Design a protein around this ligand. Sequence first.
Ligand SMILES: NC(=S)N/N=C/c1ccc(O)cc1O
Ligand SMILES: [Cl-]
Ligand SMILES: [Cl-]
Ligand SMILES: [Cl-]
Ligand SMILES: [Cl-]
Ligand SMILES: [Cl-]
Ligand SMILES: [Zn+2]
Length: 315
Amino acid sequence: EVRTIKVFTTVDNINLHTQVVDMSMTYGQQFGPTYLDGADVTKIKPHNSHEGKTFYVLPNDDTLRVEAFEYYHTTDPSFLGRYMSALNHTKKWKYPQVNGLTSIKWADNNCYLATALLTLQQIELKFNPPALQDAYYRARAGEAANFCALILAYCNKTVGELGDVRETMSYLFQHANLDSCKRVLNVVCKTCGQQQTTLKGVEAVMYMGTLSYEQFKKGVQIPCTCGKQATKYLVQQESPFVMMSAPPAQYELKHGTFTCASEYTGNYQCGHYKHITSKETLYCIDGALLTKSSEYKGPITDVFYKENSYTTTIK
Ligand SMILES: NC(=S)N/N=C/c1ccc(O)cc1O
Ligand SMILES: [Cl-]
Ligand SMILES: [Cl-]
Ligand SMILES: [Cl-]
Ligand SMILES: [Cl-]
Ligand SMILES: [Cl-]
Ligand SMILES: [Zn+2]
């Protein structure tokens, strides 16, 4: 006897596609690679309990290609399988609310993802891909499994791999609307004179080399092409935040002078991030763990500051 069930296939979990499947054949033989809420069911034959359920598939016809691109804003052929593989793990993580924010209980080297997620909830940022819009909304509400899996897929990191917070933020910023953001810098060399530069989008909100927004406004020393040392300072800034980053170093964080920051303890090959947020006092969120202090010193690698419009007085 021939036995079938009805299931739906999807690439975006919104647009469904009716299918009839043969219970004597695997999903793989019928759809190609197939997933059920992250689980790889490619080598599995249909079960009775599968009737009416939704399965993710790869974009193997033009309708799915268009639906996948519109939702994710990527055409990397291994994206969906990387997203499903991550999701099968992130759906098992825990997402406690810590001081009003969605955090992540430590697992699988995910400390960099927790600090990133905590940071996002403290800065003004809108994502462009619908997939990230929808999953970030759920994450803010507490159900961050899809959002975390998407970050991993977009950053090309697997669960368990050690991640860098600045790189992760660069990827997310690439998929956000920062088109309004503008930065003007000036560089002064005693032998070469001056040169001004204007930066836009992601490059207007990120800086690598110093943690201090004030020192960026006063000036910082960088090499020049003659061998001289030149000074770079911030001429104009238009953005709702800025991110200052540097190799980890002992640094003092003062209440009320920054929004939030990342601390990294360890070495190049492995280590651990924690998150510091400046509220009524200084809170350190380490996954599910929370402590407080009136002052803070530690190896800081990123600091986030509020902004709207700044213009220098330097002449
Ligand atoms: N190539 C064309 S026209 N669209 N494909 C979209 C697409 C493909 C693979 C994938 O994993 C995610 C996607 O958004
Ligand atoms: Cl896991
Ligand atoms: Cl927990
Ligand atoms: Cl959004
Ligand atoms: Cl204070
Ligand atoms: Cl600030
Ligand atoms: Zn020079």
